[PDB]
Amino acid sequence: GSHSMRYFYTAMSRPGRGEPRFITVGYVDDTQFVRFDSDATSPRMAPRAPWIEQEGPEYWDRETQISKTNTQTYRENLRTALRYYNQSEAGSHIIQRMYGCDLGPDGRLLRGHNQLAYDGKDYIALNEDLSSWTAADTAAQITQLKWEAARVAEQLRAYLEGECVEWLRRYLENGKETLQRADPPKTHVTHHPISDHEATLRCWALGFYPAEITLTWQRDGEDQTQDTELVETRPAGDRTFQKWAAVVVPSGEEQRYTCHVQHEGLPKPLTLRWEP
């Protein structure tokens, strides 16, 4: 299947409560595999998945040294952001960054990413060409000028097309029993009377990996999107995910409704119904 690697950086100021906390987390698809936290007793890049534990001490030293440098860089960036938005030193603010690469089924690069947000709003993004930028506001335009002058996009392009892809392929091979295994959803329909007049049909998908899934209801073959309650996909705690979709149906009309499931762990899309 297709696969992605992402690194996520977050820097959170907290005036009066020390220096801003800096965290880094790395993911392959929906599997976290490394974490750094400046609030840890001894900050290190640390393993979070068994297949990364075999990287040698030089790997962990480099990831740690870069993350400690980034702690300082992003604390400086938070000070710069106050100046860019005319904000005082009294409030708490957050910078977030994501970057990484997406591979297709053949293991070739589909596209790369590098984007930032400030206080939860988009700030700047590398365009899909990996050569130009989109700035969200006049503050980000200032950063864009700096990054054009410093040829930042060229450095990100070389990383995203090169090292990012090469390390992701290595991780995929070392974790091939899990990273390269899709677990299909276990599906079933439950029935919950509301009144004498109506009942809820709830279509469950359980135990699936990765998280991406499509779960819908039809009545007489017509999509019921606007009448379906669809919860956010949610982690079970065992690496897998859960989701359900529910419709309210008149008593005795249950066989007019069908639940439809698509997941990459399934050879073909599934249709199911309430089975009394």
């Binding site: 880094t24 790395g26 890049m45 990831e63 860089t73 930042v152 090292e163 990012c164």
Partner: peptide
């Protein structure tokens, strides 16, 4: 493996 940024100052 993380990127070693040459320039990432806002």
């Amino acid at each position: 493996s993380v990127l070693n940024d040459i320039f990432s100052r806002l």
